[PDB]
Write a protein that binds this ligand. Structure first.
Ligand SMILES: [Mg+2]
Ligand SMILES: [Mg+2]
Ligand SMILES: [Mg+2]
Ligand SMILES: [Mg+2]
Ligand SMILES: [Mg+2]
Ligand SMILES: [Mg+2]
Ligand SMILES: [Mg+2]
Ligand SMILES: [Mg+2]
Ligand SMILES: [Mg+2]
Ligand SMILES: [Mg+2]
Lengths: 32, 341, 205
RNA sequence: UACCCGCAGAAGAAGCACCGGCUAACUCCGUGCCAGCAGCCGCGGUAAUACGGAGGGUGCAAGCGUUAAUCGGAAUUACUG
């Protein structure tokens, strides 16, 4: 059961959200 | 003489290290009790038990005895050296220089023995690299991993061969089976089973976003013609498909795990190969089960942006990422072996 | 049931002098009275609407040495009573026996006064009263009892008081060590810096 | 028994929650989309006032937090409205 192990959401391709580029815009910063 | 001098201390140090690794005190204790038991005449009345006891004792003695010898041999060598120094004679000096080598060799041998505890470490094995879910990136990562492993094999002096390869449409590989061949291959590679986390900025992506991909490697030794268990003809399914007619996939129903082969030219050859692979896999699974009875899957994280590779379980970091990629992974593997996971 | 910790820290936090020490030695000499406590003292964050009110409340509570539940109760009582609420609350606070004693000058500090009260020193109409939270009514004579009359601390306290500004609403004798609570004080008799209104507001949210 | 008088000596007697915003209280260290947090918005992918520890602070206090449950805020069934 290796293929199933690879399948699990645990190992789904994450992509880091942008800070300056396309998804840059944050309505409210981490602090005020 | 300087090299000789260096060698005396170094050997001692390594012996010390070995002893520490062993945790010899416990062993000694075991031997003691066992010895006592042996000495008692009532143990030999029941034969099998007695035999078992005997078996237990000797190994314990021998490991411990070997250690003792090393301790003592080293001391003797040192004494000899001292004598040589005191009495300006060439022959004595020469003797001092020489005798140490043998001890060192012995120590090395012992260490090797310690390392490769499992029964099938000596035999050749089947590396199996399956790419992640992600997409193209995952495939690419898988391909890279494969490349790394092959280079490592080459460095070692291992004969590699691609049993199966499935390619990714854009780039990289979907999955790949590799047969490595040589002395004690599985003993090295069995540690490197598991998931490998690549973390880098994706060139296949249009934007410069930072992607996190995975790929499993899975290693199993070749156990053909030695092992008694065989696959049930009803549970075994054969299947044929096109090369990229020739290739053959095998499927096992109870466990629900498959193995394939496309390297051979005719069908018969392929099928046999598949069968061989499958049985090996089964054996591996059985042994794993046994281990479990006796008694997350991610093993390494290659972070190419920040330029650090860190084996998770062992806890060894390196910044020469490129080097590692090129097949300089020996370091990780040896650490893993030492750990004994 | 009491704040036992550092007294000047509280004062620092407040901003002002809370009179939590005897007044022999000026508060600036004992502590950095301007700079708030802790590692982040020099920084002065802009304080919120809620926050200022809270601070004010604390100040008053700190001054008198009253914990929160009691304070709340007092506030409630004030509200119940006829007339201006904040003023009423203030009056109630004043009325406390320990506070009265302090005013008279038998305790250097309010804490001292409280201690004295606890330790059966203060007779109120000839009957020993031990409760610091006891409300001293109009025309209630309140005195040191003969046993505690000899204590050097009491005389020191008196001396200190004599340096301090005297309250109009009491009448105390240094020789006899007995004072008459003549009338509950008007708001004008108390300190102007206390914004009772803020406190009132706070207890209505 | 309450209450009172005498005896000794600071002696026998302080914790819990929180500190991104709402919400009073901020910094350093470790980890690095993990481990974990979370009431909502959210935080964490190697300079985290949001995780864990420390120092510092804030709020309550012989209690302090969590959970449950009711009204409130909800003019969000509005008779008032
Ligand atoms: Mg109480
Ligand atoms: Mg009123
Ligand atoms: Mg704030
Ligand atoms: Mg928390
Ligand atoms: Mg760090
Ligand atoms: Mg940090
Ligand atoms: Mg960050
Ligand atoms: Mg923190
Ligand atoms: Mg509700
Ligand atoms: Mg309603």
């Amino acid at each position: 059961a290796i293929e199933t192990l690879l399948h699990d959401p645990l190992f789904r391709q994450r992509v880091e959200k942008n800070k300056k580029g396309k998804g840059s815009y944050m309505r409210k910063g981490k602090h005020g | 003489i300087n090299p000789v001098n260096n060698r005396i201390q170094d050997l001692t140090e390594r012996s010390d290290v070995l002893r520490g690794y062993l945790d010899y005190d416990a062993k000694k204790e075991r031997l003691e009790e066992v010895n006592a038991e042996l000495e008692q005449p009532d143990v030999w009345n029941e034969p099998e038990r007695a035999q078992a006891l005997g078996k237990e004792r000797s190994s314990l003695e021998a490991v411990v005895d070997t250690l003792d010898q090393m301790k003592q041999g080293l001391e003797d060598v040192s004494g000899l050296l001292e004598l040589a120094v005191e009495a300006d004679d060439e022959e004595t000096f020469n003797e001092a220089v020489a005798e140490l080598d043998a001890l060192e060799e012995k120590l090395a041998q012992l260490e090797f023995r310690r390392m490769f505890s499992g029964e099938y470490d000596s035999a050749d094995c089947y590396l199996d690299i399956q790419a992640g879910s992600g997409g193209t990136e995952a495939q690419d990562w898988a391909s890279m991993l494969e490349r790394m492993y092959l280079r490592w094999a080459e460095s070692r002096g291992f004969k590699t061969e691609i049993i199966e390869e499935s390619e990714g449409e854009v780039a990289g590989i979907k999955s790949v089976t590799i047969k490595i061949s040589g002395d004690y291959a599985y003993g090295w590679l069995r540690t490197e089973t598991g998931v490998h986390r690549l973390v880098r900025k994706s060139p296949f992506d249009s934007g410069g976003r930072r992607h996190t991909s995975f790929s499993s490697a899975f290693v199993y030794p070749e156990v053909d013609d030695d092992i008694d268990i065989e696959i049930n003809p009803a549970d075994l399914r054969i299947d044929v498909y096109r090369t990229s007619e020739s290739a053959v996939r095998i499927t096992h129903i109870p466990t629900g795990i498959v193995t394939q082969c496309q390297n051979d030219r005719s069908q018969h050859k392929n099928k046999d190969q598949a069968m061989k692979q499958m049985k090996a896999k089964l054996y591996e699974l059985e042994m794993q089960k046994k281990n479990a009875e006796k008694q997350g899957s991610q093993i390494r994280s290659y972070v190419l942006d920040d330029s650090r590779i860190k084996d998770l379980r062992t806890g060894v970091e390196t910044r020469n990422t490129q080097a590692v990629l090129d097949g300089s992974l020996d370091q990780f593997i040896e650490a893993s072996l030492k750990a004994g996971l | 049931a009491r704040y036992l910790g550092p007294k000047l820290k509280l004062s620092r936090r407040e901003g002002t002098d809370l009179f939590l020490k005897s007044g022999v030695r000026a508060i600036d000499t004992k502590c950095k009275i301007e700079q708030a406590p802790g590692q982040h003292g020099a920084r002065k964050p802009r304080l919120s609407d809620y926050g200022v009110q809270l601070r004010e409340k604390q100040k008053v509570r700190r001054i008198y040495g009253v914990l929160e539940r009691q304070f709340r109760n007092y506030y409630k009582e004030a509200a119940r009573l006829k007339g201006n609420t904040g003023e009423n609350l203030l009056a109630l606070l004043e009325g406390r026996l320990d506070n009265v004693v302090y005013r008279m000058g038998f305790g250097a500090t309010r804490a001292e006064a409280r201690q004295l009260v606890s330790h059966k020193a203060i007779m109120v109409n000839g009957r020993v009263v031990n409760i610091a939270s006891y409300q001293v009514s109009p025309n209630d004579v309140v005195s040191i009892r003969e046993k505690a009359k000899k204590q050097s601390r009491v005389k020191a306290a008196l001396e200190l008081a004599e340096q301090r500004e005297k309250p109009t609403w009491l009448e105390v004798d240094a020789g006899k060590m007995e004072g008459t609570f003549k009338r509950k004080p008007e708001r004008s008799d108390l300190s102007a810096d206390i914004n009772e209104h803020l406190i009132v507001e706070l207890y209505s949210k």
